Structure 1
């Protein structure tokens, strides 16, 4: 079951088989072996390439929403890693999977989010969208993505669902980075207007150790190799 680690922010108890599987499967990479400058980049591929882990995520969440009352009406996934988990849950629940993407990636009349201005040593916030009418009045939406880091896109999701005159069931993520205090900040911003938004995570990055490092040890070459170069490494 989910334990409240902080107000309206729940974490799956680490005894659960899903939590153990995630801890075992996850792989993170350091700057030299990743595309972003963060200490540990948690690779979503380490999850999707694991059949057992992918199935455990699907089963747990589907069971969770089937037993939920009132039941969710929609699943809104974030571009692009949220697309990896949303559809397999939505197909079982038999509800629509809506896409949250940048305007230049979305079709139809769109509704755009309004991100806050960035703070010193910033990092530009993303304006995200959903098609106008993809979610209606009375819709109960589950927001999904792989990792809850700073919470920028989660806030975009909240704004878009609110603008649509619908309610957020909860923000679910496979992994959370509690240090970045996304849930805490969202829960207090603008006089606690989002205080009632529930956040659920299946694993905390604090559970990831050196054993989860996917970095190649004692490697001094480039991070990216051309397909022609890789071809020359074997008889073909």
Structure 2
């Protein structure tokens, strides 16, 4: 089950089968093998390419939301990795799957979020939106993304659900980076108006070690190879 690591922030007990499976299937990359500049970049492909792991995540959340009372009315996934997990859970619960995107990606009358100031060191957040009326009044929404890093996105999620006269059941993420203190900052930002928002993660990145690095060892070539340079490496 989920244990409380900090006020209103829960982590699946590392003794569960899903925690052990995610820990076994997940893969990360150093800057030399990733497109972002972070010590370790967790690849979601390592999960979606793992049929067993993908089915496990699907079974656990579905079982969780069916057993819940009252049951959620909507699932709001984040662009774009949240799109990979949201739908398969929705189709089983038979509830709508709403998309949170940037204004230039979404259609219809939109509602843009109002992000906060960056606390120095660049990394300016993004304005996210959802179609006005996608989430009716009195709806119980489950927010979902693959990784909870800084929380900047989840916050737009909460503001959007709030602005729609709806309630956030909980923000669920596959993996979390406890060092970035997202659950903490959100729970106390602006006089703790989001204190009650529950956070659940299936795995902590503390659990990801060297055994999970996907970097090709001793490789001294480019990261991106063209299609042609690869075709001529085998008779065709």
Runs of 5+ unmatched residues, structure 2: none
Q: How far apart are 1:127 and its partner, in Å?
A: 0.3
Runs of 5+ unmatched residues, structure 1: none
- Alignment partner of 2:82: what SS? helix
Q: How far apart are 1:72 and its partner, in Å?
A: 0.2
- Alignment partner of 2:58: what SS? helix
In structure 2, distance between residues paired with 1:9 and 1:219: 40
CA RMSD of aligned residues (A): 0.4
Q: How far apart are 1:234 and its partner, in Å?
A: 1.2
- Alignment partner of 1:28: what SS? strand
Q: How far apart are 1:58 and its partner, in Å?
A: 0.2
Task: Compare 116-125 and 140-149 and name the one that shifted more.
Answer: 116-125
Residue deviations 1:59-106 (CA, integer Å, cap 9, x gap):
000000000011000000000000000000000000000000000000
- Alignment partner of 1:230: what SS? helix
In structure 2, distance between residues paired with 1:78 and 1:28: 21
User: With structure 1 as the length reference, what TM-score do the two structures score?
Assistant: 0.99
Alignment of 1:155 onto 2:155 = yes
Residue deviations 1:142-170 (CA, integer Å, cap 9, x gap):
00000000000000000000000000000
Residue deviations 1:116-164 (CA, integer Å, cap 9, x gap):
0112112110000000000011000000000000000000000000000
In structure 1, distance between residues paired with 2:13 and 2:55: 19
Task: Compare 112-121 and 26-35 and name the one that shifted more.
Answer: 112-121
Q: How far apart are 1:233 and its partner, in Å?
A: 1.2
In structure 2, distance between residues paired with 1:173 and 1:160: 18
In structure 2, distance between residues paired with 1:151 and 1:234: 46
In structure 2, distance between residues paired with 1:25 and 1:137: 39
In structure 1, distance between residues paired with 2:112 and 2:25: 36
- Alignment partner of 1:190: what SS? coil
- Alignment partner of 1:191: what SS? coil
The aligned counterpart of 2:94 is 94
The aligned counterpart of 1:166 is 166
In structure 2, distance between residues paired with 1:220 and 1:114: 44
Residue deviations 1:146-199 (CA, integer Å, cap 9, x gap):
000000000000000000000000000000000000000000000000000000
* Alignment: residue pair count: 236
In structure 2, distance between residues paired with 1:159 and 1:40: 29
The aligned counterpart of 1:48 is 48
The aligned counterpart of 1:221 is 221
In structure 2, distance between residues paired with 1:208 and 1:145: 18
In structure 1, distance between residues paired with 2:155 and 2:122: 17
- Alignment partner of 2:156: what SS? helix
Q: How far apart are 1:219 and its partner, in Å?
A: 0.6
Q: How far apart are 1:232 and its partner, in Å?
A: 1.3
Q: How far apart are 1:202 and its partner, in Å?
A: 0.1
